[PDB]
């Protein structure tokens, strides 16, 4: 309706649940449930003088739980591919997540994707801003945000870009 859907995809542990909670409730809690399956929260917004609800999903990241999450890709209006900057592996797996999304979502190389490098509050990184920025350029020229769910840094900024991408 005035409802649109976005999904966070990325390895387990990169901070998807926390990013959602920070965006939606402006809190960083340390003991979120571990969900074997998928999860969502409603974000009530107002764009162009209208009420719009962004429904934010994410999933379990383990390969063995693929079958539990891919039925909920459908209807996603934007995909937030997430890694954490402290974890090169998570960054290396971005193409994997994009391909999985594309396979199962059935949405076009014009689909809205947004890339979040999370846990930037972590000074000891495995991934440089430049290589992530690089990757985004060469892989669809997606917008890139360095975020911290813990300290809230760029989190609304990244979700707002998603909103406008969808709305566009
Ligand atoms: N330092 C730091 N820890 C974070 C951040 N985001 C999430 N966490 C922690 O990372 C761990 C995995 O978080 P979670 O939100 O469940 O990641 P998910 O599996 O991708 O949903 C948890 O212990 C979180 O508290 C962040 O930006 N910075
Ligand atoms: Sr989680």
Swiss-Prot record:
Gene Ontology molecular function: G protein activity; GDP binding; GTP binding; GTPase activity; identical protein binding
Q: Which cofactors go with this protein? A: Mg(2+)
Query: What is the disulfide pattern of this chain?
Result: none
Which residues of the sequence carry a binding annotation for Mg(2+)? 17, 35, 58
Domain of life of the source: Eukaryota
Q: Which residues bind GDP?
A: 13, 15-18, 118-119, 121, 149-150
In chain numbering, motif Switch 2 lies across 60-74
Annotated GO biological process: positive regulation of exocytosis; protein transport; Rab protein signal transduction; receptor-mediated endocytosis; regulation of protein localization; retrograde transport, endosome to Golgi
Q: Does the keyword Endoplasmic reticulum apply?
A: yes
Catalysed reaction, written as an equation: GTP + H2O = GDP + phosphate + H(+)
How does its record describe regulation of its activity?
Regulated by guanine nucleotide exchange factors (GEFs) which promote the exchange of bound GDP for free GTP. Regulated by GTPase activating proteins (GAPs) which increase the GTP hydrolysis activity. Inhibited by GDP dissociation inhibitors (GDIs).
The UniProt annotation places GTP binding at 13-18, 30, 34-35, 61, 118-119, 121, 150
What are the record keywords, sorted? Acetylation, Cell membrane, Cytoplasmic vesicle, Endoplasmic reticulum, Endosome, Golgi apparatus, GTP-binding, Hydrolase, Lipoprotein, Magnesium, Membrane, Metal-binding, Nucleotide-binding, Phosphoprotein, Prenylation, Protein transport, Transport
Task: Place the motif Switch 1 on the sequence.
Answer: 27-38
What is the membrane topology listed in the Swiss-Prot or TrEMBL record?
Answer: Lipid-anchor
Q: What does the subunit section of this Swiss-Prot or TrEMBL entry state?
A: Interacts (preferentially in its GTP-bound form) with GCC2 (via its GRIP domain). Interacts (GTP-bound form) with SGSM1; the GDP-bound form has much lower affinity for SGSM1. Interacts with SGSM2. The GTP-bound form but not the GDP-bound form interacts with HPS4 and the BLOC-3 complex (heterodimer of HPS1 and HPS4) but does not interact with HPS1 alone. Interacts (GTP-bound form) with NDE1; two RAB9A-GTP molecules lie on the opposite sides of the NDE1 homodimer; the interaction leads to RAB9A-dynein motor tethering. Interacts (GTP-bound form) with NDEL1.
What role does it play? The small GTPases Rab are key regulators of intracellular membrane trafficking, from the formation of transport vesicles to their fusion with membranes. Rabs cycle between an inactive GDP-bound form and an active GTP-bound form that is able to recruit to membranes different sets of downstream effectors directly responsible for vesicle formation, movement, tethering and fusion. RAB9A is involved in the transport of proteins between the endosomes and the trans-Golgi network (TGN).
Q: Which family does it belong to?
A: Belongs to the small GTPase superfamily. Rab family.
Q: What is this protein called?
A: Ras-related protein Rab-9A
Q: Which part of the complete protein is shown?
A: 5 to 174 of 201
């Amino acid at each position: 309706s005035s409802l649109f859907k976005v999904i966070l995809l990325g390895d387990g542990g990169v901070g998807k649940s926390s990013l959602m909670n920070r965006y939606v409730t402006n809190k960083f809690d340390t003991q979120l449930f571990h969900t074997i399956g998928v999860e969502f929260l409603n974000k009530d917004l107002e764009v162009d003088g209208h009420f719009v609800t962004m429904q934010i999903w994410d999933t379990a990241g383990q390969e063995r739980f693929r079958s539990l999450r891919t039925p909920f890709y459908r209807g996603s209006d934007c995909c937030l591919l997430t890694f954490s900057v402290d974890d090169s592996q998570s960054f290396q797996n971005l193409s994997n997540w994009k391909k999985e999304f594309i396979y199962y979502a059935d949405v076009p190389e014009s689909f809205p994707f947004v890339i979040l490098g999370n846990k930037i509050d972590i000074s000891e990184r495995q991934v440089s801003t430049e290589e992530a920025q690089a990757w985004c350029r060469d892989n669809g020229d997606y917008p890139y945000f360095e975020t911290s769910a813990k300290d809230a840094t760029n989190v609304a900024a990244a979700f707002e870009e998603a909103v406008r991408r969808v709305l566009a």
